[PDB]
Tab-separated table of N, CA and C in Angstrom:
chain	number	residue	atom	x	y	z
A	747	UNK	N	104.709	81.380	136.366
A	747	UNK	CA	103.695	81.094	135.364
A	747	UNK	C	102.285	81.156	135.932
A	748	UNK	N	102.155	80.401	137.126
A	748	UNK	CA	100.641	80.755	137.614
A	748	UNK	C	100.495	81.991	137.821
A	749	UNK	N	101.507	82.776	138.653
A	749	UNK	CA	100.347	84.446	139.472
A	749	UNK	C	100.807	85.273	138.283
A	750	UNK	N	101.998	85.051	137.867
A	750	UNK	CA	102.366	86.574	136.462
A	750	UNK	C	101.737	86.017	135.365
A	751	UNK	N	102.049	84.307	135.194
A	751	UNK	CA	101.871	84.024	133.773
A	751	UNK	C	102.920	83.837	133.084
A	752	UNK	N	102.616	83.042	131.799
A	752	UNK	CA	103.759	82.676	131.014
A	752	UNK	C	103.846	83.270	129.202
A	753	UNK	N	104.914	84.320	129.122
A	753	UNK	CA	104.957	84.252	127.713
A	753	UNK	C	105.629	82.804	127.031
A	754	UNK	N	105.196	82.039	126.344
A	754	UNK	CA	105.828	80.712	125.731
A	754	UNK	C	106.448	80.743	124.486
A	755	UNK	N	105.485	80.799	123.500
A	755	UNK	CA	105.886	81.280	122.260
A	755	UNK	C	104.372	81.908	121.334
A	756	UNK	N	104.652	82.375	120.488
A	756	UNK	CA	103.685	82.812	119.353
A	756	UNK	C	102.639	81.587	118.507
A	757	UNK	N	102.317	82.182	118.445
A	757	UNK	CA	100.807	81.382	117.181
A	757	UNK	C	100.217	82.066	115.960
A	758	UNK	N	99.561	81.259	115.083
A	758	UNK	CA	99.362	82.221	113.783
A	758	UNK	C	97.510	82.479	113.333
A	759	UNK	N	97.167	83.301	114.039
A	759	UNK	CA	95.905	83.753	114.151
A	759	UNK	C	94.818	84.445	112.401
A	760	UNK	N	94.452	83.923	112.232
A	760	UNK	CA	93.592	84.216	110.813
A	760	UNK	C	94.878	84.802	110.087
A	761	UNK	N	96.130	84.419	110.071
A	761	UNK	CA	97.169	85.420	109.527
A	761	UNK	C	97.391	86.339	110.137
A	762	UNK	N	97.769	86.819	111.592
A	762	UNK	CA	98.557	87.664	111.698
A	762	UNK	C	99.025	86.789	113.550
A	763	UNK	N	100.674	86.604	113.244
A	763	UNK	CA	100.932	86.505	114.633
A	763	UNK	C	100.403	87.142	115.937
A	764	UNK	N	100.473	85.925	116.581
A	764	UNK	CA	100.342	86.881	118.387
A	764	UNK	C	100.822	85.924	119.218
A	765	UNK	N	100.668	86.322	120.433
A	765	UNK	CA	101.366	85.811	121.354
A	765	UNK	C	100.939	84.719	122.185
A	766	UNK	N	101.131	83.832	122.565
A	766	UNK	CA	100.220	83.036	123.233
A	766	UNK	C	101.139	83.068	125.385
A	767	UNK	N	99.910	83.404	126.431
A	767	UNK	CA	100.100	83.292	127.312
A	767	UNK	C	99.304	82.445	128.357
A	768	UNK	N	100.059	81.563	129.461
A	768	UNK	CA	99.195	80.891	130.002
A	768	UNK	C	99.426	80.940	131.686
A	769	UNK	N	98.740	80.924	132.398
A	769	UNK	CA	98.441	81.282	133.502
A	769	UNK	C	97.738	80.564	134.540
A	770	UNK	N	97.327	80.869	135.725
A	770	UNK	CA	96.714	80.718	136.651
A	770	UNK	C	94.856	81.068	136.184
A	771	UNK	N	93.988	80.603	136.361
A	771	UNK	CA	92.685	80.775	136.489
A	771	UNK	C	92.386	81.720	137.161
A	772	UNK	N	91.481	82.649	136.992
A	772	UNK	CA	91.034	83.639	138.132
A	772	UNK	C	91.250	83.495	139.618
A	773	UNK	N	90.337	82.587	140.273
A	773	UNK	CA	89.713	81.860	141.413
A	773	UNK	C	91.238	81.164	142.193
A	774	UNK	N	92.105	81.342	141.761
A	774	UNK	CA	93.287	80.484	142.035
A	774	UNK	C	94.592	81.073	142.094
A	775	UNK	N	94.552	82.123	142.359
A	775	UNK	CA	95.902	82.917	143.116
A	775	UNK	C	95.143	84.713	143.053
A	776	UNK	N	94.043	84.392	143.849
A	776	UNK	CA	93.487	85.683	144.623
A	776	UNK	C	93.674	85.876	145.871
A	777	UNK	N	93.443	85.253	146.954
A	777	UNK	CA	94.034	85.547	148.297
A	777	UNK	C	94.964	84.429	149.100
A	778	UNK	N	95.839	84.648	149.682
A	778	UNK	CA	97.017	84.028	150.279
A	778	UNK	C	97.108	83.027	150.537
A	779	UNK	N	95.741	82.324	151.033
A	779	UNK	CA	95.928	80.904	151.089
A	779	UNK	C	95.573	80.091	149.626
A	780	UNK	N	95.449	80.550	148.793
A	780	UNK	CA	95.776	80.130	147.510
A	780	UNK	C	97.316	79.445	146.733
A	781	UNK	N	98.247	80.352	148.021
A	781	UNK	CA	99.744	79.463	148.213
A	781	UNK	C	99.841	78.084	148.043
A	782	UNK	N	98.567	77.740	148.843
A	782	UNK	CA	98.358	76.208	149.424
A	782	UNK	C	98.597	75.429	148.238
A	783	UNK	N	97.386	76.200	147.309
A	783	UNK	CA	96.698	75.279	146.448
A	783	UNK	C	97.454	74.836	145.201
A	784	UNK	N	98.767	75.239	145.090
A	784	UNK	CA	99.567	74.677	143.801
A	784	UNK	C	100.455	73.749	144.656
A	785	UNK	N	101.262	72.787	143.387
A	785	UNK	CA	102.220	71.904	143.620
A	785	UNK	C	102.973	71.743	142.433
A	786	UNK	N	104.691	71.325	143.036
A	786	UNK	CA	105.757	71.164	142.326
A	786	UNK	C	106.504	69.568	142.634
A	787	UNK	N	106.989	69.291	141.746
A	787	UNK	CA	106.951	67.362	141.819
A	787	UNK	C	108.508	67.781	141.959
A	788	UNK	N	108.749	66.716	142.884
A	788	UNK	CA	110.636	66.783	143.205
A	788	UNK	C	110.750	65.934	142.857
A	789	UNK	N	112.329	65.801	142.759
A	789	UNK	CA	113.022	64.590	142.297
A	789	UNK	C	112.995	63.259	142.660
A	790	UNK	N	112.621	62.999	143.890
A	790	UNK	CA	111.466	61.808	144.267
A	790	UNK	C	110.507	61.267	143.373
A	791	UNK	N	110.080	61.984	142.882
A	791	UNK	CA	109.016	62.234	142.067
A	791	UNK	C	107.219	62.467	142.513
A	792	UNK	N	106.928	62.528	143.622
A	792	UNK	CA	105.674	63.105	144.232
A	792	UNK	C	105.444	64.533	143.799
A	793	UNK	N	104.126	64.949	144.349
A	793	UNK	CA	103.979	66.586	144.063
A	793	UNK	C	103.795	66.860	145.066
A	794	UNK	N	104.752	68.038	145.497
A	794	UNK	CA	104.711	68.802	146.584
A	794	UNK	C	104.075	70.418	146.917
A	795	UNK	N	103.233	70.339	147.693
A	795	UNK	CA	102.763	71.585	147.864
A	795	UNK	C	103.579	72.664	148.531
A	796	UNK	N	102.743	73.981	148.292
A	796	UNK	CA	104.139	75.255	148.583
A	796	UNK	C	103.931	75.748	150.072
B	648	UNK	N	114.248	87.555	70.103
B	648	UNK	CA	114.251	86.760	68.771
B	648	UNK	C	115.048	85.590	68.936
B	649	UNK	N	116.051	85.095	69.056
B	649	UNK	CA	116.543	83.883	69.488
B	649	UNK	C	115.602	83.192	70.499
B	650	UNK	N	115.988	84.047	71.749
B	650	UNK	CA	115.962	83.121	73.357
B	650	UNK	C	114.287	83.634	73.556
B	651	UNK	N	113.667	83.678	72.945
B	651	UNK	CA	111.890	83.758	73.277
B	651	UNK	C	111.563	82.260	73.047
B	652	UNK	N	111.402	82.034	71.373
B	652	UNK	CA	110.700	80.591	71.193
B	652	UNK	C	111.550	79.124	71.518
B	653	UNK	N	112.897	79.426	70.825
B	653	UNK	CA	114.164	78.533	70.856
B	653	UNK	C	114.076	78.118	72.406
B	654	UNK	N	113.791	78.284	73.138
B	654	UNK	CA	114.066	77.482	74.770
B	654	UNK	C	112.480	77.428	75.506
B	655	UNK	N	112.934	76.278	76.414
B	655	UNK	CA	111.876	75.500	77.528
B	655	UNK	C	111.611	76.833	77.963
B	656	UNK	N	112.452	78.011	78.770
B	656	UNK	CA	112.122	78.885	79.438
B	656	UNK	C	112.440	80.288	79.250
B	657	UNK	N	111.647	81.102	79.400
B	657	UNK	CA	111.540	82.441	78.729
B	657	UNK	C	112.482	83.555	79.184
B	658	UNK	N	114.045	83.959	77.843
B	658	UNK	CA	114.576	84.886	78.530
B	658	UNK	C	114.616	86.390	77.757
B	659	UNK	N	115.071	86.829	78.793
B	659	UNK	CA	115.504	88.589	78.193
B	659	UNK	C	116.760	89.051	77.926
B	660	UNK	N	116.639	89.645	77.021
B	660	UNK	CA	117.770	90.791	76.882
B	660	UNK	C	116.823	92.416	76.911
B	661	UNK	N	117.747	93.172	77.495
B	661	UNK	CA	117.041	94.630	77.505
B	661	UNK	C	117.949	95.604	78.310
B	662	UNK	N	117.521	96.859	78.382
B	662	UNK	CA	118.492	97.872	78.692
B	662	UNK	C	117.309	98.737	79.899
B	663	UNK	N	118.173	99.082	80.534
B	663	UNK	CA	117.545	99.191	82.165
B	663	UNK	C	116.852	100.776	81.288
B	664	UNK	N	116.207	101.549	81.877
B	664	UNK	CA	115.876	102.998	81.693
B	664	UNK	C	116.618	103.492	82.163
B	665	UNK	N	117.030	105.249	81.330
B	665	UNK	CA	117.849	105.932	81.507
B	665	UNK	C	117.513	106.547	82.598
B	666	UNK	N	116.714	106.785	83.277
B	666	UNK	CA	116.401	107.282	84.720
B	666	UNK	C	116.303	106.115	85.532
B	667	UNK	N	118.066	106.076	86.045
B	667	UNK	CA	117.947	104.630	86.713
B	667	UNK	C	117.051	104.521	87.583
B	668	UNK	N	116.203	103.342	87.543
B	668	UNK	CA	115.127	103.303	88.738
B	668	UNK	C	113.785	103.910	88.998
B	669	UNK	N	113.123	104.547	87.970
B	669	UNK	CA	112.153	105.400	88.368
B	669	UNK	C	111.376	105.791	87.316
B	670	UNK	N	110.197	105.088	86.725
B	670	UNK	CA	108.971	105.902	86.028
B	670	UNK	C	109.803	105.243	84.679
B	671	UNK	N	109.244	103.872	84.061
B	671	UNK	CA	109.311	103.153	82.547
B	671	UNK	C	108.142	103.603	81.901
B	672	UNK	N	108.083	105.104	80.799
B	672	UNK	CA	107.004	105.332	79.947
B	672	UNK	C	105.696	104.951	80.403
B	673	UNK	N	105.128	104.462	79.481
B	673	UNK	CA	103.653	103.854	79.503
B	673	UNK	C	102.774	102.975	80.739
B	674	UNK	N	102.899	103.349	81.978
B	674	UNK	CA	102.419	102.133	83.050
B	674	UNK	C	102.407	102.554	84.003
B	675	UNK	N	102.377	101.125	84.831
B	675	UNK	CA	102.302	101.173	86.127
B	675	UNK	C	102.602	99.750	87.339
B	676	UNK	N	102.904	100.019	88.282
B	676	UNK	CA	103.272	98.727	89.051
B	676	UNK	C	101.835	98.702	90.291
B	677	UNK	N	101.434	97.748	90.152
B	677	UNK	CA	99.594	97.394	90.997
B	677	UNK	C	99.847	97.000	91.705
B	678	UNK	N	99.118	97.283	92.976
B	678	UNK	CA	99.454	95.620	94.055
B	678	UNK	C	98.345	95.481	94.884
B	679	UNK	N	97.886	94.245	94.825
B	679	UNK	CA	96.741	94.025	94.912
B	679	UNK	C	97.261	92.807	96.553
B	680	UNK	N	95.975	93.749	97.675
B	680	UNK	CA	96.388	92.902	98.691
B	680	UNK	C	95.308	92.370	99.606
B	681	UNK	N	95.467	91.818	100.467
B	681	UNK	CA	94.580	91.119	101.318
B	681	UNK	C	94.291	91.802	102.683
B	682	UNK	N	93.301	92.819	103.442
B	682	UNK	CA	93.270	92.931	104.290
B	682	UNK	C	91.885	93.093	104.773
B	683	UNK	N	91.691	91.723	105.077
B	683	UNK	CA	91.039	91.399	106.037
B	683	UNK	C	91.286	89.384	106.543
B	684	UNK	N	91.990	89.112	105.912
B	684	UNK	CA	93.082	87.710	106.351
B	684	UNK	C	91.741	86.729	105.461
B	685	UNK	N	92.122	86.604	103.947
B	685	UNK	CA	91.020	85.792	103.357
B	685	UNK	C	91.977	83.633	103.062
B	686	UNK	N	93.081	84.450	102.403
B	686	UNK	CA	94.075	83.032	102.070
B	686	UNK	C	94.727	83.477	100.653
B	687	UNK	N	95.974	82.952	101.424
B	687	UNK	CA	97.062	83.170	99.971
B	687	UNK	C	96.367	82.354	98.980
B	688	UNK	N	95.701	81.209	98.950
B	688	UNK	CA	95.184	80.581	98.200
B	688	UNK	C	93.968	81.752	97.573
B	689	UNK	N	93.416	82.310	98.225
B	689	UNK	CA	92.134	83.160	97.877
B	689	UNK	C	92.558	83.994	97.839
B	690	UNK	N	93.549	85.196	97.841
B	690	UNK	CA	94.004	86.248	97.771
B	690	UNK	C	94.227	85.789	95.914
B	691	UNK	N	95.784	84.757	95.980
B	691	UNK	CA	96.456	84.496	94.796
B	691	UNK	C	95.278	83.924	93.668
B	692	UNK	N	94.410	83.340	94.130
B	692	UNK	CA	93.352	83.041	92.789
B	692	UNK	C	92.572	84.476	92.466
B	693	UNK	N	92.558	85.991	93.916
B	693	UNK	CA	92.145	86.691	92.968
B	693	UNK	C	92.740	87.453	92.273
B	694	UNK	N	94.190	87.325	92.333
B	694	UNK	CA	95.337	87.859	91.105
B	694	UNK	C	95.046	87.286	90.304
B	695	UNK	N	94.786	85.886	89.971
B	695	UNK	CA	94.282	85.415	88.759
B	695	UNK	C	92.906	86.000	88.077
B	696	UNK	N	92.151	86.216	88.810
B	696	UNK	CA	91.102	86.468	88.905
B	696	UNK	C	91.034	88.108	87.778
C	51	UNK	N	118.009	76.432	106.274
C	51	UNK	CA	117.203	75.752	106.525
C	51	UNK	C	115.151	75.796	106.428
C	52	UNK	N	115.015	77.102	106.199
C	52	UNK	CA	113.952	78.021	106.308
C	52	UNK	C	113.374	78.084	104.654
C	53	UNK	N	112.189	77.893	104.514
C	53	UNK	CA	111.050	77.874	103.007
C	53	UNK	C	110.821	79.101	103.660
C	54	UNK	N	109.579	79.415	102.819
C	54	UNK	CA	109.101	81.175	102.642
C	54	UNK	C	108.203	80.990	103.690
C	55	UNK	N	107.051	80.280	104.176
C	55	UNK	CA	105.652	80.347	105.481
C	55	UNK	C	107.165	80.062	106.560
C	56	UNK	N	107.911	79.569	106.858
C	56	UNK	CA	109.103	80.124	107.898
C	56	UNK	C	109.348	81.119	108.206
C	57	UNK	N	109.601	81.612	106.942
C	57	UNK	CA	110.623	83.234	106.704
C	57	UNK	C	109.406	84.699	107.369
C	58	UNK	N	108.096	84.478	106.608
C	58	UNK	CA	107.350	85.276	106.890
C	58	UNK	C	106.718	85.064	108.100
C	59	UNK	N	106.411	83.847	108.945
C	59	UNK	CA	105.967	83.701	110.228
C	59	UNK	C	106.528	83.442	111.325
C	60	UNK	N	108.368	83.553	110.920
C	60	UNK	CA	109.367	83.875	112.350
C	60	UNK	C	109.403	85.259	112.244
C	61	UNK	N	110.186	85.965	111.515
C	61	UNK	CA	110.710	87.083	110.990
C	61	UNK	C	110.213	87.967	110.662
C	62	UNK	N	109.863	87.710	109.232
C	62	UNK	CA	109.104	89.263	108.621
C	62	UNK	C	107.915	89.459	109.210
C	63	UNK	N	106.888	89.271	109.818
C	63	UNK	CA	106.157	89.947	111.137
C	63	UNK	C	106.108	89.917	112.071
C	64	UNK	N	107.544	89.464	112.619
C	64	UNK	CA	107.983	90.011	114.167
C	64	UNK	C	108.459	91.282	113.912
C	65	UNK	N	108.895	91.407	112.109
C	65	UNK	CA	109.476	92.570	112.673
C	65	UNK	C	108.585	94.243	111.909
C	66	UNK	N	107.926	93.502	110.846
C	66	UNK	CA	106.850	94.606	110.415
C	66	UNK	C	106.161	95.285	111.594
C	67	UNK	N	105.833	94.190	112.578
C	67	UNK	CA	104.830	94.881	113.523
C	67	UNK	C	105.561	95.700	114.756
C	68	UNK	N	107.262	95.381	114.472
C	68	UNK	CA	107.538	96.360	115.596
C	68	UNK	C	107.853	97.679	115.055
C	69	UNK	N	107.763	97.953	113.446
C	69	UNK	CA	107.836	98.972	112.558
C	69	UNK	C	107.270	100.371	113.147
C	70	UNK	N	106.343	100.894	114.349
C	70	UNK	CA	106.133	101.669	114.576
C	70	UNK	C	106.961	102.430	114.483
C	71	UNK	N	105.910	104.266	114.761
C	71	UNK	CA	107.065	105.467	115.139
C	71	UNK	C	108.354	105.534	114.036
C	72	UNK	N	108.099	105.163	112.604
C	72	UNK	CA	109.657	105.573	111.240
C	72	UNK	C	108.716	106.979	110.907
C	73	UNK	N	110.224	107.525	110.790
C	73	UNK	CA	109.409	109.620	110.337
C	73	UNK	C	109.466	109.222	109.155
C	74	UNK	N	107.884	109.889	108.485
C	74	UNK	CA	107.971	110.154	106.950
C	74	UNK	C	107.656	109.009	105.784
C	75	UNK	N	107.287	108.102	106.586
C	75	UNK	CA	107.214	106.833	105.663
C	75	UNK	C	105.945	106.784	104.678
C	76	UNK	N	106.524	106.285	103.733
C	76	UNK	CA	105.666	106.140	102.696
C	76	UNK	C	105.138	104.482	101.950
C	77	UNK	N	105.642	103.556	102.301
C	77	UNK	CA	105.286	102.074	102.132
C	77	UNK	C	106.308	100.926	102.386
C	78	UNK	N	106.146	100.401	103.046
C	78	UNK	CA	106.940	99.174	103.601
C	78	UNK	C	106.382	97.623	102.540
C	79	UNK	N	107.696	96.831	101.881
C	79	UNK	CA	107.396	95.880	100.988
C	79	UNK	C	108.265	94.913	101.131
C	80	UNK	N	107.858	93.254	101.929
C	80	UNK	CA	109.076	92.406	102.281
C	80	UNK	C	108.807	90.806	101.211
C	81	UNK	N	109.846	90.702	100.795
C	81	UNK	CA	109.973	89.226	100.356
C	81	UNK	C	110.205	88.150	101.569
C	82	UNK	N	109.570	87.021	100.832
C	82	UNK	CA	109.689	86.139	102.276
C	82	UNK	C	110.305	84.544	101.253
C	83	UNK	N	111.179	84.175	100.998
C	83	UNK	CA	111.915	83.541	99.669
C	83	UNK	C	111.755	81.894	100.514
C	84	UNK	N	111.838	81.212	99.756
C	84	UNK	CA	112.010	79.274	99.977
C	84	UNK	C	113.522	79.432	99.934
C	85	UNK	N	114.727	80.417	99.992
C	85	UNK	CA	115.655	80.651	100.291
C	85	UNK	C	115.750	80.699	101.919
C	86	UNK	N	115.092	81.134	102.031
C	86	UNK	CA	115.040	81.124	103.759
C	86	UNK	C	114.993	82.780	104.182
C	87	UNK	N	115.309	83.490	102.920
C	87	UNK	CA	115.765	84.453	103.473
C	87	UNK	C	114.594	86.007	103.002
C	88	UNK	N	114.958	86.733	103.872
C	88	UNK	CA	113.163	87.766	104.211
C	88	UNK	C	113.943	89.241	103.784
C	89	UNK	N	113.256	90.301	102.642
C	89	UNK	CA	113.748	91.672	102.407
C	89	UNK	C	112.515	92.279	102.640
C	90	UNK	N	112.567	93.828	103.462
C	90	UNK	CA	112.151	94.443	103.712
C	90	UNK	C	112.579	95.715	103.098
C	91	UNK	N	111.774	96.469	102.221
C	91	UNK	CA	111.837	97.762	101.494
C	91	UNK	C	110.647	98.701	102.268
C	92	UNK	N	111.372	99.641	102.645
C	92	UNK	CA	110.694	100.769	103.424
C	92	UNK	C	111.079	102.470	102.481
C	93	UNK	N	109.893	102.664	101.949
C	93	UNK	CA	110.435	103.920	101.196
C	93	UNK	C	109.795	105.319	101.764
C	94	UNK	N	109.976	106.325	101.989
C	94	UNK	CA	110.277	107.675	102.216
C	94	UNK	C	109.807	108.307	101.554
C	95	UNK	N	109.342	109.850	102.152
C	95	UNK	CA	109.191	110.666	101.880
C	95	UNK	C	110.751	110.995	100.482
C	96	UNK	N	110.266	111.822	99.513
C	96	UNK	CA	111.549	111.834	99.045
C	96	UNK	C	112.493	112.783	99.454
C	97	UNK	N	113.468	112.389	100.067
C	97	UNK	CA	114.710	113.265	100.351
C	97	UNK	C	114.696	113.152	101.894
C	98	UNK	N	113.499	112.779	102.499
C	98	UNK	CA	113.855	112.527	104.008
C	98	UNK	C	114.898	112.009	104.457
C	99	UNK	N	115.788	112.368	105.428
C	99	UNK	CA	117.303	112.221	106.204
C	99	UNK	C	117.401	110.404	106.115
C	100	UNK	N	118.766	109.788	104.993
C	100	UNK	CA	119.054	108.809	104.856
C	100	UNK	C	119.022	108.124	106.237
């Protein structure tokens, strides 16, 4: 969902469906150490970085 | 003649055209549509309209 | 389970809009019913291949 993005589901725009996608910010999965900068919460329950 | 005035709601009797499906004499079928996304509400008041 | 703003904003324009590329077409016309249920009439050139 952050570097490709996420198709989720649709929305209804002045009347005509589209798609709604959500993603990463520009600035935030451009070069490699950008790895760093996300986190995933384990079953512990903390957030863990990648 | 019966089922017009005699009832709450309005029915028919009638016989389809002999060219099943295609071109009843005198008319035409209209259709009036919305494109540029105004509102069924504003579309349908201008069928009334 | 489905009214008609269901019928027409799951269905009948997911699938109008994937309508591209039909040979010969001449007007596409869909009901969208408080039945739940959505008709699509697509008519032809006349005599174009059933």
């Amino acid at each position: 969902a952050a570097w490709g993005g996420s198709y989720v589901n649709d929305f209804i725009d002045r009347g005509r469906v589209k798609k709604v996608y959500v993603m990463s910010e520009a600035k935030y999965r451009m070069l490699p150490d950008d790895i760093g900068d996300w986190y995933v919460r384990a079953a512990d329950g903390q957030m863990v970085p990648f | 003649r019966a089922f017009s005035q005699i009832k709450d709601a309005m029915v028919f009797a009638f016989n389809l055209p002999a060219i099943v499906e295609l071109g009843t004499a005198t008319g035409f079928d209209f259709e009036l549509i919305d494109q540029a996304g105004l509102g069924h509400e504003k579309l349908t008041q201008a069928r009334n309209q | 389970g489905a009214d008609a703003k269901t019928v027409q904003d799951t269905v009948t324009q997911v699938i109008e809009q994937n309508m591209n590329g039909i040979d010969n077409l001449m007007y596409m016309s869909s009901n969208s019913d408080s039945t739940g249920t959505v008709q699509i009439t697509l008519t032809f050139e006349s005599g174009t291949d059933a």
